[PDB]
Amino acid sequence: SEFGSMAGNCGARGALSAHTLLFDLPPALLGELCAVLDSCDGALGWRGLAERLSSSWLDVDHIEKEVDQGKSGTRELLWSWAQKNKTIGDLLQVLQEMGHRRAIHLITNYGAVLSPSEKSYQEG
């Protein structure tokens, strides 16, 4: 089933964030990265974000598989835990390395105020 062919590419993106949730933060991360990078043809590299993280050596095998199913490079990486289980700041560092200009544009949808982030500098 490796390097096979299949159909099922769909997604959503817009001015309003329909992907707003605690685990699966707004389209700034999952929505934009899975949709915009899906149409990627080496310009940004579907596996470009996943490759940098290097979660697994065999990850690239499945990357080719879901690329036609709405992205596997970034989508599979985010979908590895629950839905995304990541934060905009975490992927922002990776995005900067790759140079994803479009991602930067949509990353502003997350917001810089009232965000679900904690300092985590407390002990008890």
mmCIF file with all atom_site columns, all heavy atoms in Angstrom, residues 10-39:
data_model
loop_
_atom_site.group_PDB
_atom_site.id
_atom_site.type_symbol
_atom_site.label_atom_id
_atom_site.label_alt_id
_atom_site.label_comp_id
_atom_site.label_asym_id
_atom_site.label_entity_id
_atom_site.label_seq_id
_atom_site.pdbx_PDB_ins_code
_atom_site.Cartn_x
_atom_site.Cartn_y
_atom_site.Cartn_z
_atom_site.occupancy
_atom_site.B_iso_or_equiv
_atom_site.pdbx_formal_charge
_atom_site.auth_seq_id
_atom_site.auth_comp_id
_atom_site.auth_asym_id
_atom_site.auth_atom_id
_atom_site.pdbx_PDB_model_num
ATOM 1   N N   . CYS A 1 10 ? -9.811  17.522 0.974  1.00 0.00 ? 10 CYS A N   1
ATOM 2   C CA  . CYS A 1 10 ? -10.780 18.535 1.380  1.00 0.00 ? 10 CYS A CA  1
ATOM 3   C C   . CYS A 1 10 ? -10.250 19.343 2.563  1.00 0.00 ? 10 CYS A C   1
ATOM 4   O O   . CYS A 1 10 ? -9.323  18.916 3.248  1.00 0.00 ? 10 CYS A O   1
ATOM 5   C CB  . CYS A 1 10 ? -12.112 17.878 1.748  1.00 0.00 ? 10 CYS A CB  1
ATOM 6   S SG  . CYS A 1 10 ? -12.021 16.756 3.163  1.00 0.00 ? 10 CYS A SG  1
ATOM 7   N N   . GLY A 1 11 ? -10.849 20.507 2.795  1.00 0.00 ? 11 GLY A N   1
ATOM 8   C CA  . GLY A 1 11 ? -10.429 21.362 3.893  1.00 0.00 ? 11 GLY A CA  1
ATOM 9   C C   . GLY A 1 11 ? -11.211 22.659 3.927  1.00 0.00 ? 11 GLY A C   1
ATOM 10  O O   . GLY A 1 11 ? -12.075 22.880 3.080  1.00 0.00 ? 11 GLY A O   1
ATOM 11  N N   . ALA A 1 12 ? -10.910 23.520 4.898  1.00 0.00 ? 12 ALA A N   1
ATOM 12  C CA  . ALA A 1 12 ? -11.604 24.798 5.019  1.00 0.00 ? 12 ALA A CA  1
ATOM 13  C C   . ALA A 1 12 ? -10.687 25.878 5.589  1.00 0.00 ? 12 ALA A C   1
ATOM 14  O O   . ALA A 1 12 ? -9.831  25.599 6.428  1.00 0.00 ? 12 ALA A O   1
ATOM 15  C CB  . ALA A 1 12 ? -12.840 24.646 5.896  1.00 0.00 ? 12 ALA A CB  1
ATOM 16  N N   . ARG A 1 13 ? -10.878 27.109 5.119  1.00 0.00 ? 13 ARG A N   1
ATOM 17  C CA  . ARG A 1 13 ? -10.089 28.250 5.572  1.00 0.00 ? 13 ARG A CA  1
ATOM 18  C C   . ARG A 1 13 ? -10.851 29.541 5.273  1.00 0.00 ? 13 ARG A C   1
ATOM 19  O O   . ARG A 1 13 ? -11.572 29.615 4.277  1.00 0.00 ? 13 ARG A O   1
ATOM 20  C CB  . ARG A 1 13 ? -8.725  28.276 4.870  1.00 0.00 ? 13 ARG A CB  1
ATOM 21  C CG  . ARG A 1 13 ? -7.715  29.216 5.516  1.00 0.00 ? 13 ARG A CG  1
ATOM 22  C CD  . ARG A 1 13 ? -6.599  29.574 4.547  1.00 0.00 ? 13 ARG A CD  1
ATOM 23  N NE  . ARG A 1 13 ? -7.087  30.407 3.449  1.00 0.00 ? 13 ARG A NE  1
ATOM 24  C CZ  . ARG A 1 13 ? -6.399  30.642 2.333  1.00 0.00 ? 13 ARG A CZ  1
ATOM 25  N NH1 . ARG A 1 13 ? -5.191  30.116 2.172  1.00 0.00 ? 13 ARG A NH1 1
ATOM 26  N NH2 . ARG A 1 13 ? -6.921  31.401 1.379  1.00 0.00 ? 13 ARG A NH2 1
ATOM 27  N N   . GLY A 1 14 ? -10.703 30.547 6.126  1.00 0.00 ? 14 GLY A N   1
ATOM 28  C CA  . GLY A 1 14 ? -11.401 31.803 5.905  1.00 0.00 ? 14 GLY A CA  1
ATOM 29  C C   . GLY A 1 14 ? -11.020 32.869 6.912  1.00 0.00 ? 14 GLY A C   1
ATOM 30  O O   . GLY A 1 14 ? -10.137 32.655 7.742  1.00 0.00 ? 14 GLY A O   1
ATOM 31  N N   . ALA A 1 15 ? -11.685 34.024 6.824  1.00 0.00 ? 15 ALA A N   1
ATOM 32  C CA  . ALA A 1 15 ? -11.430 35.140 7.734  1.00 0.00 ? 15 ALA A CA  1
ATOM 33  C C   . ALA A 1 15 ? -11.736 34.753 9.177  1.00 0.00 ? 15 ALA A C   1
ATOM 34  O O   . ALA A 1 15 ? -11.016 35.131 10.102 1.00 0.00 ? 15 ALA A O   1
ATOM 35  C CB  . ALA A 1 15 ? -12.250 36.356 7.324  1.00 0.00 ? 15 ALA A CB  1
ATOM 36  N N   . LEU A 1 16 ? -12.818 34.005 9.362  1.00 0.00 ? 16 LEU A N   1
ATOM 37  C CA  . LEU A 1 16 ? -13.213 33.550 10.687 1.00 0.00 ? 16 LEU A CA  1
ATOM 38  C C   . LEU A 1 16 ? -12.612 32.176 10.952 1.00 0.00 ? 16 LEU A C   1
ATOM 39  O O   . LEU A 1 16 ? -12.569 31.327 10.061 1.00 0.00 ? 16 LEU A O   1
ATOM 40  C CB  . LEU A 1 16 ? -14.742 33.496 10.805 1.00 0.00 ? 16 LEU A CB  1
ATOM 41  C CG  . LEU A 1 16 ? -15.466 32.789 9.656  1.00 0.00 ? 16 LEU A CG  1
ATOM 42  C CD1 . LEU A 1 16 ? -16.287 31.620 10.179 1.00 0.00 ? 16 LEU A CD1 1
ATOM 43  C CD2 . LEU A 1 16 ? -16.351 33.767 8.899  1.00 0.00 ? 16 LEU A CD2 1
ATOM 44  N N   . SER A 1 17 ? -12.144 31.957 12.172 1.00 0.00 ? 17 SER A N   1
ATOM 45  C CA  . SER A 1 17 ? -11.536 30.685 12.519 1.00 0.00 ? 17 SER A CA  1
ATOM 46  C C   . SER A 1 17 ? -12.588 29.653 12.923 1.00 0.00 ? 17 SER A C   1
ATOM 47  O O   . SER A 1 17 ? -13.191 29.743 13.995 1.00 0.00 ? 17 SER A O   1
ATOM 48  C CB  . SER A 1 17 ? -10.535 30.905 13.654 1.00 0.00 ? 17 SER A CB  1
ATOM 49  O OG  . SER A 1 17 ? -11.054 31.804 14.621 1.00 0.00 ? 17 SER A OG  1
ATOM 50  N N   . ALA A 1 18 ? -12.789 28.661 12.057 1.00 0.00 ? 18 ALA A N   1
ATOM 51  C CA  . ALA A 1 18 ? -13.750 27.589 12.311 1.00 0.00 ? 18 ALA A CA  1
ATOM 52  C C   . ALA A 1 18 ? -13.079 26.421 13.025 1.00 0.00 ? 18 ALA A C   1
ATOM 53  O O   . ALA A 1 18 ? -13.738 25.482 13.469 1.00 0.00 ? 18 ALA A O   1
ATOM 54  C CB  . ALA A 1 18 ? -14.380 27.124 11.007 1.00 0.00 ? 18 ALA A CB  1
ATOM 55  N N   . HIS A 1 19 ? -11.760 26.504 13.134 1.00 0.00 ? 19 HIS A N   1
ATOM 56  C CA  . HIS A 1 19 ? -10.963 25.463 13.770 1.00 0.00 ? 19 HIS A CA  1
ATOM 57  C C   . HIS A 1 19 ? -10.520 25.884 15.168 1.00 0.00 ? 19 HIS A C   1
ATOM 58  O O   . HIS A 1 19 ? -9.535  25.377 15.678 1.00 0.00 ? 19 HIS A O   1
ATOM 59  C CB  . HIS A 1 19 ? -9.731  25.130 12.920 1.00 0.00 ? 19 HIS A CB  1
ATOM 60  C CG  . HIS A 1 19 ? -10.050 24.509 11.595 1.00 0.00 ? 19 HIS A CG  1
ATOM 61  N ND1 . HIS A 1 19 ? -10.389 25.228 10.470 1.00 0.00 ? 19 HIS A ND1 1
ATOM 62  C CD2 . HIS A 1 19 ? -10.073 23.203 11.224 1.00 0.00 ? 19 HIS A CD2 1
ATOM 63  C CE1 . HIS A 1 19 ? -10.601 24.358 9.475  1.00 0.00 ? 19 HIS A CE1 1
ATOM 64  N NE2 . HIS A 1 19 ? -10.422 23.116 9.880  1.00 0.00 ? 19 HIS A NE2 1
ATOM 65  N N   . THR A 1 20 ? -11.225 26.833 15.772 1.00 0.00 ? 20 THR A N   1
ATOM 66  C CA  . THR A 1 20 ? -10.854 27.317 17.101 1.00 0.00 ? 20 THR A CA  1
ATOM 67  C C   . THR A 1 20 ? -11.219 26.322 18.210 1.00 0.00 ? 20 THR A C   1
ATOM 68  O O   . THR A 1 20 ? -12.398 26.089 18.482 1.00 0.00 ? 20 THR A O   1
ATOM 69  C CB  . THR A 1 20 ? -11.541 28.664 17.406 1.00 0.00 ? 20 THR A CB  1
ATOM 70  O OG1 . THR A 1 20 ? -11.352 29.569 16.315 1.00 0.00 ? 20 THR A OG1 1
ATOM 71  C CG2 . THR A 1 20 ? -10.984 29.290 18.678 1.00 0.00 ? 20 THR A CG2 1
ATOM 72  N N   . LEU A 1 21 ? -10.188 25.768 18.855 1.00 0.00 ? 21 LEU A N   1
ATOM 73  C CA  . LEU A 1 21 ? -10.346 24.827 19.969 1.00 0.00 ? 21 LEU A CA  1
ATOM 74  C C   . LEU A 1 21 ? -9.054  24.776 20.788 1.00 0.00 ? 21 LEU A C   1
ATOM 75  O O   . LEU A 1 21 ? -8.007  25.210 20.318 1.00 0.00 ? 21 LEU A O   1
ATOM 76  C CB  . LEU A 1 21 ? -10.738 23.425 19.485 1.00 0.00 ? 21 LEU A CB  1
ATOM 77  C CG  . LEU A 1 21 ? -12.237 23.226 19.215 1.00 0.00 ? 21 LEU A CG  1
ATOM 78  C CD1 . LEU A 1 21 ? -12.491 21.912 18.494 1.00 0.00 ? 21 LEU A CD1 1
ATOM 79  C CD2 . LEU A 1 21 ? -13.024 23.277 20.518 1.00 0.00 ? 21 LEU A CD2 1
ATOM 80  N N   . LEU A 1 22 ? -9.139  24.269 22.018 1.00 0.00 ? 22 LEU A N   1
ATOM 81  C CA  . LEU A 1 22 ? -7.973  24.200 22.911 1.00 0.00 ? 22 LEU A CA  1
ATOM 82  C C   . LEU A 1 22 ? -6.854  23.284 22.389 1.00 0.00 ? 22 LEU A C   1
ATOM 83  O O   . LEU A 1 22 ? -5.693  23.690 22.345 1.00 0.00 ? 22 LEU A O   1
ATOM 84  C CB  . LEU A 1 22 ? -8.417  23.730 24.303 1.00 0.00 ? 22 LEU A CB  1
ATOM 85  C CG  . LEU A 1 22 ? -7.301  23.619 25.346 1.00 0.00 ? 22 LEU A CG  1
ATOM 86  C CD1 . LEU A 1 22 ? -6.677  24.980 25.617 1.00 0.00 ? 22 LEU A CD1 1
ATOM 87  C CD2 . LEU A 1 22 ? -7.833  23.009 26.634 1.00 0.00 ? 22 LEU A CD2 1
ATOM 88  N N   . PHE A 1 23 ? -7.195  22.056 21.998 1.00 0.00 ? 23 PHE A N   1
ATOM 89  C CA  . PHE A 1 23 ? -6.186  21.105 21.506 1.00 0.00 ? 23 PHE A CA  1
ATOM 90  C C   . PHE A 1 23 ? -5.845  21.349 20.040 1.00 0.00 ? 23 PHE A C   1
ATOM 91  O O   . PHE A 1 23 ? -4.701  21.179 19.612 1.00 0.00 ? 23 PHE A O   1
ATOM 92  C CB  . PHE A 1 23 ? -6.673  19.663 21.693 1.00 0.00 ? 23 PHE A CB  1
ATOM 93  C CG  . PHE A 1 23 ? -6.783  19.246 23.134 1.00 0.00 ? 23 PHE A CG  1
ATOM 94  C CD1 . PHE A 1 23 ? -7.995  19.316 23.803 1.00 0.00 ? 23 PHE A CD1 1
ATOM 95  C CD2 . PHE A 1 23 ? -5.668  18.788 23.821 1.00 0.00 ? 23 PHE A CD2 1
ATOM 96  C CE1 . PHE A 1 23 ? -8.093  18.934 25.126 1.00 0.00 ? 23 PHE A CE1 1
ATOM 97  C CE2 . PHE A 1 23 ? -5.762  18.404 25.144 1.00 0.00 ? 23 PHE A CE2 1
ATOM 98  C CZ  . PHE A 1 23 ? -6.977  18.477 25.798 1.00 0.00 ? 23 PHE A CZ  1
ATOM 99  N N   . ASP A 1 24 ? -6.852  21.738 19.279 1.00 0.00 ? 24 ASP A N   1
ATOM 100 C CA  . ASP A 1 24 ? -6.698  22.025 17.861 1.00 0.00 ? 24 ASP A CA  1
ATOM 101 C C   . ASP A 1 24 ? -6.906  23.507 17.614 1.00 0.00 ? 24 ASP A C   1
ATOM 102 O O   . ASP A 1 24 ? -7.941  23.907 17.106 1.00 0.00 ? 24 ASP A O   1
ATOM 103 C CB  . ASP A 1 24 ? -7.635  21.190 16.971 1.00 0.00 ? 24 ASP A CB  1
ATOM 104 C CG  . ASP A 1 24 ? -9.064  21.116 17.472 1.00 0.00 ? 24 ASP A CG  1
ATOM 105 O OD1 . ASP A 1 24 ? -9.273  20.696 18.635 1.00 0.00 ? 24 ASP A OD1 1
ATOM 106 O OD2 . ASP A 1 24 ? -9.975  21.469 16.700 1.00 0.00 ? 24 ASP A OD2 1
ATOM 107 N N   . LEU A 1 25 ? -5.936  24.307 18.061 1.00 0.00 ? 25 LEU A N   1
ATOM 108 C CA  . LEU A 1 25 ? -5.965  25.768 17.924 1.00 0.00 ? 25 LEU A CA  1
ATOM 109 C C   . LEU A 1 25 ? -6.404  26.205 16.517 1.00 0.00 ? 25 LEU A C   1
ATOM 110 O O   . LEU A 1 25 ? -6.283  25.438 15.560 1.00 0.00 ? 25 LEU A O   1
ATOM 111 C CB  . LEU A 1 25 ? -4.574  26.334 18.233 1.00 0.00 ? 25 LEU A CB  1
ATOM 112 C CG  . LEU A 1 25 ? -4.089  26.111 19.666 1.00 0.00 ? 25 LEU A CG  1
ATOM 113 C CD1 . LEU A 1 25 ? -2.646  26.566 19.826 1.00 0.00 ? 25 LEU A CD1 1
ATOM 114 C CD2 . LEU A 1 25 ? -4.990  26.830 20.658 1.00 0.00 ? 25 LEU A CD2 1
ATOM 115 N N   . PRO A 1 26 ? -6.929  27.456 16.398 1.00 0.00 ? 26 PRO A N   1
ATOM 116 C CA  . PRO A 1 26 ? -7.429  28.052 15.139 1.00 0.00 ? 26 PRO A CA  1
ATOM 117 C C   . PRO A 1 26 ? -6.593  27.723 13.892 1.00 0.00 ? 26 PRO A C   1
ATOM 118 O O   . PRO A 1 26 ? -5.446  27.280 13.994 1.00 0.00 ? 26 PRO A O   1
ATOM 119 C CB  . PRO A 1 26 ? -7.381  29.570 15.422 1.00 0.00 ? 26 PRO A CB  1
ATOM 120 C CG  . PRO A 1 26 ? -6.876  29.725 16.823 1.00 0.00 ? 26 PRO A CG  1
ATOM 121 C CD  . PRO A 1 26 ? -7.088  28.407 17.503 1.00 0.00 ? 26 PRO A CD  1
ATOM 122 N N   . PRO A 1 27 ? -7.159  27.986 12.681 1.00 0.00 ? 27 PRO A N   1
ATOM 123 C CA  . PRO A 1 27 ? -6.510  27.706 11.390 1.00 0.00 ? 27 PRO A CA  1
ATOM 124 C C   . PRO A 1 27 ? -5.084  28.230 11.261 1.00 0.00 ? 27 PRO A C   1
ATOM 125 O O   . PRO A 1 27 ? -4.406  27.919 10.296 1.00 0.00 ? 27 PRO A O   1
ATOM 126 C CB  . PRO A 1 27 ? -7.404  28.399 10.365 1.00 0.00 ? 27 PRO A CB  1
ATOM 127 C CG  . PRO A 1 27 ? -8.741  28.412 10.996 1.00 0.00 ? 27 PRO A CG  1
ATOM 128 C CD  . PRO A 1 27 ? -8.503  28.560 12.477 1.00 0.00 ? 27 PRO A CD  1
ATOM 129 N N   . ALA A 1 28 ? -4.632  29.027 12.217 1.00 0.00 ? 28 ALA A N   1
ATOM 130 C CA  . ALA A 1 28 ? -3.283  29.564 12.186 1.00 0.00 ? 28 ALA A CA  1
ATOM 131 C C   . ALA A 1 28 ? -2.256  28.436 12.087 1.00 0.00 ? 28 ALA A C   1
ATOM 132 O O   . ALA A 1 28 ? -1.228  28.588 11.426 1.00 0.00 ? 28 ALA A O   1
ATOM 133 C CB  . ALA A 1 28 ? -3.022  30.408 13.426 1.00 0.00 ? 28 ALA A CB  1
ATOM 134 N N   . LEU A 1 29 ? -2.524  27.303 12.743 1.00 0.00 ? 29 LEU A N   1
ATOM 135 C CA  . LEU A 1 29 ? -1.595  26.179 12.679 1.00 0.00 ? 29 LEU A CA  1
ATOM 136 C C   . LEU A 1 29 ? -2.131  25.021 11.826 1.00 0.00 ? 29 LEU A C   1
ATOM 137 O O   . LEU A 1 29 ? -1.749  24.879 10.671 1.00 0.00 ? 29 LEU A O   1
ATOM 138 C CB  . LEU A 1 29 ? -1.254  25.676 14.082 1.00 0.00 ? 29 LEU A CB  1
ATOM 139 C CG  . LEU A 1 29 ? 0.217   25.304 14.275 1.00 0.00 ? 29 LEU A CG  1
ATOM 140 C CD1 . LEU A 1 29 ? 1.107   26.479 13.906 1.00 0.00 ? 29 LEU A CD1 1
ATOM 141 C CD2 . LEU A 1 29 ? 0.477   24.868 15.706 1.00 0.00 ? 29 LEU A CD2 1
ATOM 142 N N   . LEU A 1 30 ? -3.037  24.214 12.385 1.00 0.00 ? 30 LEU A N   1
ATOM 143 C CA  . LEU A 1 30 ? -3.584  23.056 11.668 1.00 0.00 ? 30 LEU A CA  1
ATOM 144 C C   . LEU A 1 30 ? -4.343  23.433 10.395 1.00 0.00 ? 30 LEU A C   1
ATOM 145 O O   . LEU A 1 30 ? -4.085  22.863 9.339  1.00 0.00 ? 30 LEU A O   1
ATOM 146 C CB  . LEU A 1 30 ? -4.506  22.234 12.582 1.00 0.00 ? 30 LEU A CB  1
ATOM 147 C CG  . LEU A 1 30 ? -4.153  20.745 12.708 1.00 0.00 ? 30 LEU A CG  1
ATOM 148 C CD1 . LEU A 1 30 ? -5.170  20.033 13.588 1.00 0.00 ? 30 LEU A CD1 1
ATOM 149 C CD2 . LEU A 1 30 ? -4.088  20.083 11.338 1.00 0.00 ? 30 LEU A CD2 1
ATOM 150 N N   . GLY A 1 31 ? -5.258  24.397 10.484 1.00 0.00 ? 31 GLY A N   1
ATOM 151 C CA  . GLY A 1 31 ? -6.056  24.769 9.319  1.00 0.00 ? 31 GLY A CA  1
ATOM 152 C C   . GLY A 1 31 ? -5.244  25.256 8.124  1.00 0.00 ? 31 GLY A C   1
ATOM 153 O O   . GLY A 1 31 ? -5.406  24.754 7.013  1.00 0.00 ? 31 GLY A O   1
ATOM 154 N N   . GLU A 1 32 ? -4.360  26.219 8.352  1.00 0.00 ? 32 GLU A N   1
ATOM 155 C CA  . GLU A 1 32 ? -3.540  26.782 7.283  1.00 0.00 ? 32 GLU A CA  1
ATOM 156 C C   . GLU A 1 32 ? -2.443  25.832 6.810  1.00 0.00 ? 32 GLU A C   1
ATOM 157 O O   . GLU A 1 32 ? -2.227  25.690 5.608  1.00 0.00 ? 32 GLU A O   1
ATOM 158 C CB  . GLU A 1 32 ? -2.935  28.112 7.738  1.00 0.00 ? 32 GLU A CB  1
ATOM 159 C CG  . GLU A 1 32 ? -2.271  28.907 6.619  1.00 0.00 ? 32 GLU A CG  1
ATOM 160 C CD  . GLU A 1 32 ? -0.799  28.588 6.457  1.00 0.00 ? 32 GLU A CD  1
ATOM 161 O OE1 . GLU A 1 32 ? -0.178  28.127 7.437  1.00 0.00 ? 32 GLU A OE1 1
ATOM 162 O OE2 . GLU A 1 32 ? -0.263  28.805 5.350  1.00 0.00 ? 32 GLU A OE2 1
ATOM 163 N N   . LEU A 1 33 ? -1.751  25.179 7.741  1.00 0.00 ? 33 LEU A N   1
ATOM 164 C CA  . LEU A 1 33 ? -0.659  24.283 7.367  1.00 0.00 ? 33 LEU A CA  1
ATOM 165 C C   . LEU A 1 33 ? -1.153  23.057 6.598  1.00 0.00 ? 33 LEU A C   1
ATOM 166 O O   . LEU A 1 33 ? -0.499  22.618 5.656  1.00 0.00 ? 33 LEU A O   1
ATOM 167 C CB  . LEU A 1 33 ? 0.171   23.863 8.589  1.00 0.00 ? 33 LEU A CB  1
ATOM 168 C CG  . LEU A 1 33 ? 0.952   25.000 9.260  1.00 0.00 ? 33 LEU A CG  1
ATOM 169 C CD1 . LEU A 1 33 ? 1.627   24.509 10.533 1.00 0.00 ? 33 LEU A CD1 1
ATOM 170 C CD2 . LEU A 1 33 ? 1.979   25.589 8.304  1.00 0.00 ? 33 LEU A CD2 1
ATOM 171 N N   . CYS A 1 34 ? -2.295  22.494 6.985  1.00 0.00 ? 34 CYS A N   1
ATOM 172 C CA  . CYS A 1 34 ? -2.808  21.318 6.283  1.00 0.00 ? 34 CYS A CA  1
ATOM 173 C C   . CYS A 1 34 ? -3.417  21.679 4.924  1.00 0.00 ? 34 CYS A C   1
ATOM 174 O O   . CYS A 1 34 ? -3.354  20.889 3.984  1.00 0.00 ? 34 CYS A O   1
ATOM 175 C CB  . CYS A 1 34 ? -3.841  20.567 7.135  1.00 0.00 ? 34 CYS A CB  1
ATOM 176 S SG  . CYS A 1 34 ? -5.446  21.390 7.270  1.00 0.00 ? 34 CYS A SG  1
ATOM 177 N N   . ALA A 1 35 ? -3.998  22.874 4.818  1.00 0.00 ? 35 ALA A N   1
ATOM 178 C CA  . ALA A 1 35 ? -4.634  23.303 3.569  1.00 0.00 ? 35 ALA A CA  1
ATOM 179 C C   . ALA A 1 35 ? -3.656  23.933 2.573  1.00 0.00 ? 35 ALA A C   1
ATOM 180 O O   . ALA A 1 35 ? -3.551  23.483 1.432  1.00 0.00 ? 35 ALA A O   1
ATOM 181 C CB  . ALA A 1 35 ? -5.770  24.271 3.864  1.00 0.00 ? 35 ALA A CB  1
ATOM 182 N N   . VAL A 1 36 ? -2.947  24.972 3.008  1.00 0.00 ? 36 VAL A N   1
ATOM 183 C CA  . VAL A 1 36 ? -2.010  25.688 2.140  1.00 0.00 ? 36 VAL A CA  1
ATOM 184 C C   . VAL A 1 36 ? -0.835  24.817 1.689  1.00 0.00 ? 36 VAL A C   1
ATOM 185 O O   . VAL A 1 36 ? -0.487  24.805 0.504  1.00 0.00 ? 36 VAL A O   1
ATOM 186 C CB  . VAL A 1 36 ? -1.480  26.971 2.828  1.00 0.00 ? 36 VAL A CB  1
ATOM 187 C CG1 . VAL A 1 36 ? -0.349  27.606 2.026  1.00 0.00 ? 36 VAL A CG1 1
ATOM 188 C CG2 . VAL A 1 36 ? -2.611  27.966 3.026  1.00 0.00 ? 36 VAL A CG2 1
ATOM 189 N N   . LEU A 1 37 ? -0.240  24.071 2.615  1.00 0.00 ? 37 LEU A N   1
ATOM 190 C CA  . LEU A 1 37 ? 0.906   23.227 2.276  1.00 0.00 ? 37 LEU A CA  1
ATOM 191 C C   . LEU A 1 37 ? 0.472   22.022 1.446  1.00 0.00 ? 37 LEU A C   1
ATOM 192 O O   . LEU A 1 37 ? 1.292   21.376 0.805  1.00 0.00 ? 37 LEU A O   1
ATOM 193 C CB  . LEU A 1 37 ? 1.655   22.761 3.525  1.00 0.00 ? 37 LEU A CB  1
ATOM 194 C CG  . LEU A 1 37 ? 2.193   23.873 4.428  1.00 0.00 ? 37 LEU A CG  1
ATOM 195 C CD1 . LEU A 1 37 ? 2.947   23.277 5.600  1.00 0.00 ? 37 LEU A CD1 1
ATOM 196 C CD2 . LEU A 1 37 ? 3.086   24.825 3.644  1.00 0.00 ? 37 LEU A CD2 1
ATOM 197 N N   . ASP A 1 38 ? -0.819  21.702 1.481  1.00 0.00 ? 38 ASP A N   1
ATOM 198 C CA  . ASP A 1 38 ? -1.353  20.581 0.709  1.00 0.00 ? 38 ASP A CA  1
ATOM 199 C C   . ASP A 1 38 ? -1.111  20.789 -0.784 1.00 0.00 ? 38 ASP A C   1
ATOM 200 O O   . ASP A 1 38 ? -0.809  19.845 -1.514 1.00 0.00 ? 38 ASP A O   1
ATOM 201 C CB  . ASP A 1 38 ? -2.850  20.404 0.979  1.00 0.00 ? 38 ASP A CB  1
ATOM 202 C CG  . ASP A 1 38 ? -3.465  19.294 0.151  1.00 0.00 ? 38 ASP A CG  1
ATOM 203 O OD1 . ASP A 1 38 ? -3.437  18.134 0.603  1.00 0.00 ? 38 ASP A OD1 1
ATOM 204 O OD2 . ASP A 1 38 ? -3.966  19.589 -0.956 1.00 0.00 ? 38 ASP A OD2 1
ATOM 205 N N   . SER A 1 39 ? -1.242  22.034 -1.227 1.00 0.00 ? 39 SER A N   1
ATOM 206 C CA  . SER A 1 39 ? -1.045  22.383 -2.633 1.00 0.00 ? 39 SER A CA  1
ATOM 207 C C   . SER A 1 39 ? 0.437   22.591 -2.956 1.00 0.00 ? 39 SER A C   1
ATOM 208 O O   . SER A 1 39 ? 0.792   22.953 -4.079 1.00 0.00 ? 39 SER A O   1
ATOM 209 C CB  . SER A 1 39 ? -1.845  23.644 -2.983 1.00 0.00 ? 39 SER A CB  1
ATOM 210 O OG  . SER A 1 39 ? -1.392  24.770 -2.247 1.00 0.00 ? 39 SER A OG  1
#
